[PDB]
Each structure stands twice: as C-alpha cells, then as structure tokens.
Coordinates of N, CA, C and O in Angstrom, one line a residue:
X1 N -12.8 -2.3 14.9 CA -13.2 -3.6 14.2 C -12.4 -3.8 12.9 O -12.3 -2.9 12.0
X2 N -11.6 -5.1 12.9 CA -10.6 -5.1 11.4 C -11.3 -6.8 11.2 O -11.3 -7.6 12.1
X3 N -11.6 -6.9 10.1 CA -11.7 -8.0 9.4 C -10.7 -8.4 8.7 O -9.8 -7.6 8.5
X4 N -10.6 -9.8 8.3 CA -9.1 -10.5 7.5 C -9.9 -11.0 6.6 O -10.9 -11.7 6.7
X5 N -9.3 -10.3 5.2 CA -9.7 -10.6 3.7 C -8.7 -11.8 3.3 O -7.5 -11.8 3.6
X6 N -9.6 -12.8 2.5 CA -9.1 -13.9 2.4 C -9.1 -14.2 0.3 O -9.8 -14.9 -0.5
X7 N -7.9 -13.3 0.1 CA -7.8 -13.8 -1.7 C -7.9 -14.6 -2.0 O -7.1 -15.4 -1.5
X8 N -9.1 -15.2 -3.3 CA -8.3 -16.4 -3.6 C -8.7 -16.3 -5.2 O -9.6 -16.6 -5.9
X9 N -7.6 -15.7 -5.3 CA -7.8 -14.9 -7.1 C -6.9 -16.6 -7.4 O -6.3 -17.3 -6.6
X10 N -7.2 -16.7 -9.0 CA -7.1 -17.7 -9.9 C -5.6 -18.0 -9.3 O -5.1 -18.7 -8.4
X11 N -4.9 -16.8 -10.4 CA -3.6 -16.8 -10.3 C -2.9 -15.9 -9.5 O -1.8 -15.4 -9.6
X12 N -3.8 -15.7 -8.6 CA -3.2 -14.9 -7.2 C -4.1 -15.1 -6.0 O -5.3 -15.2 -5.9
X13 N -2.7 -15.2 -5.0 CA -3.7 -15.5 -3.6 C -3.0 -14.7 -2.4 O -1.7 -14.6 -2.4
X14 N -3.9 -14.2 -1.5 CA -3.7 -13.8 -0.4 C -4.2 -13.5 1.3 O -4.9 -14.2 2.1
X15 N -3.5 -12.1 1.4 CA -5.1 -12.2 2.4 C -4.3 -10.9 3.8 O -3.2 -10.9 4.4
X16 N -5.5 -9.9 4.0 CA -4.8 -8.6 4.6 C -6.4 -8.3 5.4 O -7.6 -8.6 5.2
X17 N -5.5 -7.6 6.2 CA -6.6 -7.0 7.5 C -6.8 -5.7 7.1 O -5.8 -5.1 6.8
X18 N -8.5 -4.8 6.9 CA -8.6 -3.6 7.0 C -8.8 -2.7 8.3 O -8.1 -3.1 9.2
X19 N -9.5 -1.7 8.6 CA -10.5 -1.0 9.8 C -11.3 -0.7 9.3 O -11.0 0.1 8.4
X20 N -12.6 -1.1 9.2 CA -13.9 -0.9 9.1 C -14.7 -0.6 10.0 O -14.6 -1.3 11.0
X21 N -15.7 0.3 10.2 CA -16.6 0.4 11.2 C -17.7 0.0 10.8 O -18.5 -0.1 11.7
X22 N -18.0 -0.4 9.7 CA -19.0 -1.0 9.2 C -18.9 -2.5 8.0 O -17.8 -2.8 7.6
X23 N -20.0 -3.3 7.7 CA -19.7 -3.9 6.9 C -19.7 -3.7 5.5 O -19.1 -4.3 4.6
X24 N -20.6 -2.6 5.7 CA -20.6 -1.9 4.0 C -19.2 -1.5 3.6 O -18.6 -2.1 2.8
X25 N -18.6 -0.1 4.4 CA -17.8 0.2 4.1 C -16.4 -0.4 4.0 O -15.3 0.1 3.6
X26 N -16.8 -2.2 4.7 CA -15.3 -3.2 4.7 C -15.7 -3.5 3.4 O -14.6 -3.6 2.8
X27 N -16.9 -3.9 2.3 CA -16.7 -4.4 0.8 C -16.1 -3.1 0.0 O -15.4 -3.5 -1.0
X28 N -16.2 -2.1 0.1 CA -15.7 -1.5 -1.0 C -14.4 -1.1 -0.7 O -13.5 -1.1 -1.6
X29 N -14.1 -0.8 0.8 CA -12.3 -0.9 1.2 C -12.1 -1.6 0.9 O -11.6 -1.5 -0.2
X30 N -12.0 -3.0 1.3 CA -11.0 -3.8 0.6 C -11.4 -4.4 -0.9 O -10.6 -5.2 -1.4
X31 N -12.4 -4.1 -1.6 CA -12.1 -4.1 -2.9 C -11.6 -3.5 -3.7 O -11.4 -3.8 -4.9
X32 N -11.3 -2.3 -2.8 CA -10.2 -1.4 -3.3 C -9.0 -1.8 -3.6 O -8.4 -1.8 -4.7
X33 N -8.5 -2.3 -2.2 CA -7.4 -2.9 -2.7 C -7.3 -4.5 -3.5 O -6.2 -5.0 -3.9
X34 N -8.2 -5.0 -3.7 CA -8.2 -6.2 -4.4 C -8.0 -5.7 -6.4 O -7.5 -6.3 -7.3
X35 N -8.5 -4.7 -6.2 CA -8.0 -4.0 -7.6 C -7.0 -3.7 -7.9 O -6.7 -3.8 -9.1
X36 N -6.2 -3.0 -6.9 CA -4.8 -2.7 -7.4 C -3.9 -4.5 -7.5 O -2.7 -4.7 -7.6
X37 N -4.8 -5.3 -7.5 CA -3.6 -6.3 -7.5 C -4.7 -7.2 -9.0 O -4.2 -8.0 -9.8
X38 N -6.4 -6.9 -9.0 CA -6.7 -7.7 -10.8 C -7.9 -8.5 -10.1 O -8.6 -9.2 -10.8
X39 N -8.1 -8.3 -8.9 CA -9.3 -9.9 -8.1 C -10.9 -8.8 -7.6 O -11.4 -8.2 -6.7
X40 N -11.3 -9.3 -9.0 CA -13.0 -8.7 -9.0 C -13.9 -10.0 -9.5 O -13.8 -10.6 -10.6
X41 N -14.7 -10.2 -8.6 CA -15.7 -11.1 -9.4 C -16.8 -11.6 -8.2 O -18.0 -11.5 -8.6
X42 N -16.6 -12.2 -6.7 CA -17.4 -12.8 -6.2 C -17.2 -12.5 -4.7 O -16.1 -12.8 -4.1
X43 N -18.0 -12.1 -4.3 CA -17.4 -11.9 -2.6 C -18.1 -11.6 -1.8 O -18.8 -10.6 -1.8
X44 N -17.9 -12.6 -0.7 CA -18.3 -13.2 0.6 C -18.1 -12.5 1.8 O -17.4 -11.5 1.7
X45 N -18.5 -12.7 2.7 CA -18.2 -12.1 4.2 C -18.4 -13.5 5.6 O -19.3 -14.4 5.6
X46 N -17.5 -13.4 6.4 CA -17.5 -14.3 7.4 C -18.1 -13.6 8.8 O -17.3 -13.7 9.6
X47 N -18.9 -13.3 9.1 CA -19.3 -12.7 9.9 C -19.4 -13.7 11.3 O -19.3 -13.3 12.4
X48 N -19.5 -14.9 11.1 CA -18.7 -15.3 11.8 C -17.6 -15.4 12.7 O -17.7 -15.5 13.9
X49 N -16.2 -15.4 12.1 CA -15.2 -15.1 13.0 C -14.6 -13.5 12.1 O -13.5 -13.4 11.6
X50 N -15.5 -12.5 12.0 CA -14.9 -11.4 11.1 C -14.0 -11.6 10.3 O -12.9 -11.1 10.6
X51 N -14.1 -12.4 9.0 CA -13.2 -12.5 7.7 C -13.7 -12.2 6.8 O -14.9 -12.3 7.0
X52 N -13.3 -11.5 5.5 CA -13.8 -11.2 4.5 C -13.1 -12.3 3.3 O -12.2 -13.1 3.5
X53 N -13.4 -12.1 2.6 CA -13.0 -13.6 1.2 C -14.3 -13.2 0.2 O -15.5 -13.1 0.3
X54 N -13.1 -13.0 -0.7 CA -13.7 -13.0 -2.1 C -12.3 -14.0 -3.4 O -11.0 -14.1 -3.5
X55 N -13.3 -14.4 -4.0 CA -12.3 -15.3 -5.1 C -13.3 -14.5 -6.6 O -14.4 -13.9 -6.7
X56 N -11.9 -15.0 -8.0 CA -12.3 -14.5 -8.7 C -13.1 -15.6 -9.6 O -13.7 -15.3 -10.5

C-alpha cells in the first residue's frame, strides 16, 4: 500500500509516494520527509483514492 502525498507548502510545492502498511505509520513517514524540505502545520488524508496532503 503507497499513498501519494500532496505538498502544498506556501512557498513550496510538491508531492511523492511512500509504503505504508498502515495509516498511522504513513503521517509520520511522510512528515518526515516534509521536514527535511520546512512543510509542518496541517494535514489531511484521502482515503479515498489513497493520497496524503498536508499544506502549511
């Protein structure tokens, strides 16, 4: 199971696939990597079509 994280930092935007087996463990994986690039503040899940998105 890989979800597609959807950046949408101020002054940065993006958007990357992890592997998660769970949904818990997909918020803190990819806020992991949303730190190495500055995008902490608000974040969503699509469980819907499995996307993740968080904006800052």
């Amino acid at each position: 199971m890989t979800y597609k994280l959807i950046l949408n930092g101020k002054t940065l935007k993006g958007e990357t696939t992890t592997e998660a087996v769970d949904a818990a463990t997909a918020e803190k994986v990819f806020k992991q990597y949303a730190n190495d690039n500055g995008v902490d503040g608000e974040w969503t899940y699509d469980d819907a079509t499995k996307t993740f998105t968080v904006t800052e």
